Design a protein around this ligand. Structure first.
Ligand SMILES: C[C@H](CCC(=O)NCCC[N+](C)(C)CCCS(=O)(=O)[O-])[C@H]1CC[C@H]2[C@@H]3[C@H](O)C[C@@H]4C[C@H](O)CC[C@]4(C)[C@H]3C[C@H](O)[C@]12C
Ligand SMILES: *C/C=C(C)/C=C/C=C(C)/C=C/C1=C(C)CCCC1(C)C
Ligand SMILES: CCCCCCCCCCCCCCCC
Ligand SMILES: CCCCCCCCCCCC
Ligand SMILES: CCCCCCCCCCCC
Ligand SMILES: CCCCCCCCCCCC
Ligand SMILES: CCCCCCCCCCCC
Ligand SMILES: CCCCCCCCCCCC
Ligand SMILES: CCCCCCCCCCCC
Ligand SMILES: CCCCCCCCCCCC
Ligand SMILES: CCCCCCCCCC
Ligand SMILES: CCCCCCCCCC
Ligand SMILES: CCCCCCCCCC
Ligand SMILES: CCCCCCCCCC
Ligand SMILES: CCCCCCCCC
Length: 226
């Protein structure tokens, strides 16, 4: 009966349909390189579907006391993001032939970003919630820096069509990811200005764009073929 349920339902639908479509297209292709991108990219909305569905059915929500009140916090989001965000990075890394060490560092930073975001989301001392938020944001900015400078440098050694597809996906990633810390800061987890129903709408748009939108761009490109 929670007012945000409608956006959880729509999120479930869009992630489910995205997953099914990517699976149908992916199962059809024979190229080994393209199959790898399909496998990674189909798994992303599949995981998001399972977590959206879990939240829709009333799981992954806990009450956290801070600022003198009991606050509803969706922790299931972090279980989704812990796996889906590095998978998205791996898609980008494979496109540009990024170094193994660069991948390890980016994925490591991503784990820090999600883990500290979750710790912040669960923290009972109000001021300290924002310390964890700041650490998580710093880790995110490391990732965006590496994507923008490092991965782009690697992309420039690829065929222009691969570099071009990478730049579109890079741009989508920078724009969408950079919004998440702001939604958290102003929403249910942070300042409590934006109500949970609207916050859930915002994360749904961001999530669907970052997974299904991203995947549509990637999987329709010739860049994924060996
Ligand atoms: C029956 C079970 C468990 C009861 C304890 C409860 C727990 C959470 C409930 C759902 C959510 O509330 C979201 C949504 C709100 C709409 O209003 C009506 C439909 C829907 C899907 C709900 C149906 C049902 O009521 C659920 C599954
Ligand atoms: C499919 C889901 C995606 C692409 C989610 C990306 C999520 C982030 C970039 C979240 C970053 C966060 C911070 C920068 C600090 C506050 C808490 C986190 C998890 C929301
Ligand atoms: C050579 C040096 C250094 C670097 C670094 C700086 C810092 C900072 C921050 C942040 C963030 C994107 C941050 C990107 C991109 C689109
Ligand atoms: C209340 C709603 C959420 C709903 C929806 C949908 C199911 C997916 C329909 C697929 C039509 C293309
Ligand atoms: C319902 C499905 C989502 C699934 C798929 C993913 C990919 C499996 C990886 C194994 C192939 C290397
Ligand atoms: C009185 C103050 C405590 C203050 C503040 C702040 C530091 C904000 C820096 C954010 C780092 C990303
Ligand atoms: C009374 C003060 C405490 C002060 C100040 C602040 C600034 C912290 C800057 C941290 C940047 C990462
Ligand atoms: C190999 C472990 C990954 C760590 C990558 C470096 C950096 C950053 C930090 C996040 C920061 C606050
Ligand atoms: C396009 C940005 C408009 C955002 C307006 C935010 C406002 C809030 C609040 C007043 C609140 C209690
Ligand atoms: C309790 C609530 C109603 C509230 C308010 C406000 C502001 C959210 C608008 C910001 C969306 C970008
Ligand atoms: C009270 C209306 C219940 C409808 C739930 C639909 C969610 C399933 C995703 C399509
Ligand atoms: C096509 C996507 C199927 C995913 C199966 C996992 C369902 C578990 C939801 C709780
Ligand atoms: C009392 C607030 C002190 C904040 C310490 C933040 C240090 C973390 C840097 C990684
Ligand atoms: C109450 C006003 C808040 C509604 C803004 C939500 C717009 C989301 C579109 C991305
Ligand atoms: C992985 C980063 C650990 C930093 C802990 C700082 C604790 C702040 C209260």
């Amino acid at each position: 009966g929670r007012p945000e349920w409608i956006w959880l339902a729509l999120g479930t639908a869009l992630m489910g349909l995205g997953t099914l479509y990517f699976l149908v297209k992916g199962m059809g292709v024979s190229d080994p390189d393209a199959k790898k991108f399909y496998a990674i990219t189909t798994l992303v909305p599949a995981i998001a579907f399972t977590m959206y569905l879990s939240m829709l059915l009333g799981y992954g929500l806990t009450m956290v006391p801070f600022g003198g009140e009991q606050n509803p916090i969706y922790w299931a989001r972090y279980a989704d993001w812990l796996f889906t965000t590095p998978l998205l990075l791996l898609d980008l890394a494979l496109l540009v032939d990024a170094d193994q060490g660069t991948i390890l560092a980016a994925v490591g930073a991503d784990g820090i970003m999600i883990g500290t975001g979750l710790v912040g989301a669960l923290t009972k001392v109000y001021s300290y919630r924002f310390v964890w938020w700041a650490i998580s944001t710093a880790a995110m900015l490391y990732i965006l820096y590496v994507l923008f400078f490092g991965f782009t440098s690697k992309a420039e050694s690829m065929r222009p069509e691969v570099a071009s597809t990478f730049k579109v996906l890079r741009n989508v990633t920078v724009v969408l990811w950079s919004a998440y810390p702001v939604v958290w800061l102003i929403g249910s987890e942070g300042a409590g200005i934006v109500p949970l129903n609207i916050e859930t709408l915002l994360f749904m748009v961001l999530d669907v764009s970052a997974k299904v939108g991203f995947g549509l761009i990637l999987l329709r490109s010739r860049a994924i073929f060996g």
